[PDB]
Structure formats: structure tokens, C-alpha cells
Write a protein that holds these residues in place. Structure first.
Motif, PDB file in Angstrom:
ATOM      1  N   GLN A 103     110.620 -12.435 -52.133  1.00 14.45           N
ATOM      2  CA  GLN A 103     109.778 -12.907 -53.231  1.00 14.45           C
ATOM      3  C   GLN A 103     108.552 -12.022 -53.433  1.00 14.45           C
ATOM      4  N   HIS A 158     112.869  -8.123 -53.391  1.00 13.23           N
ATOM      5  CA  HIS A 158     112.913  -9.332 -54.203  1.00 13.23           C
ATOM      6  C   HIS A 158     113.412 -10.539 -53.414  1.00 13.23           C
ATOM      7  CE1 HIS A 158     113.337  -6.688 -58.085  1.00 13.23           C
ATOM      8  NE2 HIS A 158     112.248  -6.421 -57.384  1.00 13.23           N
ATOM      9  N   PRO A 190     111.203 -15.633 -46.238  1.00  6.62           N
ATOM     10  CA  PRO A 190     110.375 -15.214 -47.373  1.00  6.62           C
ATOM     11  C   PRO A 190     109.070 -14.588 -46.898  1.00  6.62           C
ATOM     12  CG  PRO A 190     110.196 -17.570 -47.066  1.00  6.62           C
ATOM     13  CD  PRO A 190     111.283 -17.102 -46.138  1.00  6.62           C
ATOM     14  N   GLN A 212     111.942 -10.956 -61.657  1.00  6.31           N
ATOM     15  CA  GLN A 212     112.078  -9.794 -60.792  1.00  6.31           C
ATOM     16  C   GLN A 212     112.842  -8.653 -61.460  1.00  6.31           C
ATOM     17  OE1 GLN A 212     113.806 -11.716 -57.244  1.00  6.31           O
ATOM     18  NE2 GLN A 212     111.709 -12.260 -56.655  1.00  6.31           N
TER      19      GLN A 212
END
Length: 325
Positions: A129, A126, A299, A178
Motif C-alpha cells: 500500500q 503496491h 502492509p 495505484q
């Protein structure tokens, strides 16, 4: 530098052989002493739209993740063809004897070690992302040991079965966060604890009702936070059965696991606990090791997420090169 064939025919690259098929996946032993690795070949994947871009994502997704609890690539071999009919790719993954699906049915020390690895791997995911979006015991790679690695990833019909899926995913009560992978963890949590499946819905018609008993009827701000209109109508029209009797729900559980269950299974993604927050739960007191809970430093870039065509067949060759520079 590669050799054939069976079964079925695939060219390994000779760094590993024997080559027995566990299922398409085979287990092999690197000649270099790298011991037992799992090799996955992709049949087709160039055969159409979708299944091309799917394996571009999976390829880039395994690479981006370095975590003990998340599967990644040991090596990726040029399925040697010089672009003449380059039809397939082989990803090398570490060999996991089994999955959680095999042994769940039907120990409080064994679960806390399991879930801790579940959640740690969940947090790393998570942080980048990226969401699994489907979490089943079949997706949790386990050998014993009891080390855990999270299998597959995010990606109609149906009549199909997801009893671990979040009520916001299907039923689309509202849009999600999430925290949906945690509802799945909560459902798997129960199944190991309760020895039985938590929500065996014939369908959403039965599922929600089967879900309804344990978490009880929602008349806080949960309703009107729902996309609704009929769903909020259905929620309110349904009798406000009074929740939440967890202690009564699990006799064979300590107050701790019951408490983690309660926060993990919650109607609203807003209120529901996160992966980082659930790691803080005292349930991990034996296992809790903040050092082992990393976040992805960058990310995950989705850039190419039409869009496109054999450029994707060509984009996959950027990697397999990029891996070898």
C-alpha cells in the motif's frame, strides 16, 4: 570507531572507506568484502518540520521493502554521536552505476527486460500500500547488466516538470489509484521506444492538449467520472477527435508493445491496467517469471504519518537500534 573527513566532512564508521563522492552520495567499499556500496548522508533533516518526518518515512520505507527491483538498506550506521548533537544519518544502499535518465535518449529486447523489472518492483510496492507517486527515468537505477532498482519514493511552486505524471494526479480529474505509476511506466516506455519524450507540455494548458492527440478525446463514461465541473465541460466542449491509432503512432514497434502501451496509457484509473495484470502481458514472454514477482507479506504501517517534533528526532533512534536490535 569512525573517521573524518572530506569531501565534504562526514564520519563513515570505517567499515567502508574510499569514499569517492559520486554526488549527497558517495560510493564506498566495505572492509568485510561486501564490495561496492552506495552511502547517502543526510545534511540537516533535523533543520525543520517536514524534512524531519520525510526522512523518518524514507528510513522506515526502505526497511519494509525487500525486493530485487526496489532499493533497500545494506546497513545503517549510528552516525556516531551519543545523542549529543545527533545531527545526521547515513543510509547504506547498493551501488548502481547509472540511472535510466542517462541512457534513454535519443531495443525491443532491452526494453522488455527493463519494463519487466519496472513492473515487478512496482507490484511489490503496491502490495504494501505504498506509491512512488512520481516515476521518472531519473528514479530508475540501472547499471549494465541492466538490472533495475526503483529510486526514491512518494512525497507547491511550480512551473516544474513532470511529463510522466498521471492526468489524475495533476488536473485532478478525479481521485486516483495505484495505476498512476503505470501511466508513468507507459510514458517512459514510449520514450525508449519512440526515442523521444511523449508529453513535453509547456504546462497543463499545453500538456493535456499534447496528451490529447495520442489518446484522443474522451466521450465514454470517463467524463462525469471526472471531478470536473469545468474539466468535464472542457472535455465535451473540445471536439471529440477520434482515437486510438497506436499502430500509426509507433512504426518502430511490434503489435505487442503497442498493445501494452494502449492498456498502460488510459484515461480512467478504473479501466487502466494494474502492475500485476501488466506483468501477465505477452510482452514478457521471454522474461516472464512469476516466481520473481513477490508481494509484501505485511502492509506498510504509516502509524506516525504537529505530528510531531523532536520525538521524530528521537523516533529515528528507535531505528538504527531496531536495525541492530
Amino acid at each position: 570507531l569512525k573517521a573524518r573527513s572530506f569531501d565534504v566532512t562526514f564520519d563513515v564508521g570505517d567499515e567502508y572507506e574510499i569514499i569517492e563522492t559520486i554526488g549527497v552520495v558517495s560510493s564506498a567499499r566495505r572492509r568485510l568484502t561486501g564490495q561496492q556500496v552506495a552511502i547517502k548522508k543526510i545534511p540537516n533533516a533535523f533543520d525543520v518540520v517536514t524534512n524531519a518526518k520525510r526522512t523518518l518515512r524514507e528510513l522506515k520505507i526502505l526497511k519494509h521493502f525487500k525486493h530485487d527491483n526496489i532499493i533497500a538498506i545494506k546497513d545503517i550506521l549510528r552516525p556516531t554521536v551519543p545523542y549529543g548533537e545527533f545531527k545526521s544519518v547515513y543510509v547504506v544502499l547498493d551501488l548502481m552505476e547509472s540511472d535510466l535518465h542517462q541512457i534513454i535518449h535519443s531495443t525491443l529486447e532491452h526494453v522488455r527486460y527493463f519494463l519487466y523489472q519496472l513492473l515487478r518492483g512496482l507490484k511489490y510496492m503496491h502490495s504494501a500500500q505504498v506509491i512512488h507517486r512520481d516515476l521518472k527515468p531519473s528514479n530508475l537505477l540501472v547499471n549494465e547488466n541492466c538490472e533495475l532498482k526503483i529510486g526514491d519514493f512518494g512525497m507547491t511552486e511550480y512551473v516544474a516538470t513532470r511529463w510522466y505524471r498521471a492526468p489524475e494526479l495533476m488536473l485532478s480529474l478525479h481521485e486516483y489509484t495505484q495505476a498512476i505509476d503505470l501511466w508513468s511506466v507507459g510514458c517512459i516506455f514510449g520514450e525508449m521506444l519512440a526515442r523521444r519524450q511523449l508529453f513535453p507540455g509547456k504546462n497543463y494548458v499545453h500538456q493535456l492538449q499534447l496528451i490529447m492527440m495520442v489518446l484522443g478525446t474522451p466521450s465514454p463514461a470517463v467524463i462525469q467520472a471526472v471531478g470536473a465541473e469545468r474539466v468535464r465541460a472542457y472535455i465535451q466542449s473540445l471536439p471529440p477527435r477520434q482515437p486510438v491509432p497506436w499502430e500509426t503512432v509507433y512504426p518502430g514497434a511490434d503489435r505487442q508493445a503497442l498493445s501494452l502501451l494502449g492498456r498502460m496509457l488510459r484515461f480512467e484509473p478504473s479501466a487502466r491496467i494494474s502492475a500485476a495484470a501488466a506483468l501477465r502481458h505477452p510482452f514478457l514472454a521471454k522474461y516472464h517469471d512469476p516466481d520473481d514477482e513477490p508481494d509484501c507479506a505485511p502492509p506498510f504501517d504509516f502509524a506516525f504519518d504537529a505530528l510531531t517534533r523532536e520525538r521524530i528526532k528521537e523516533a529515528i533512534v528507535a531505528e538504527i537500534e531496531d536495525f541492530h536490535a
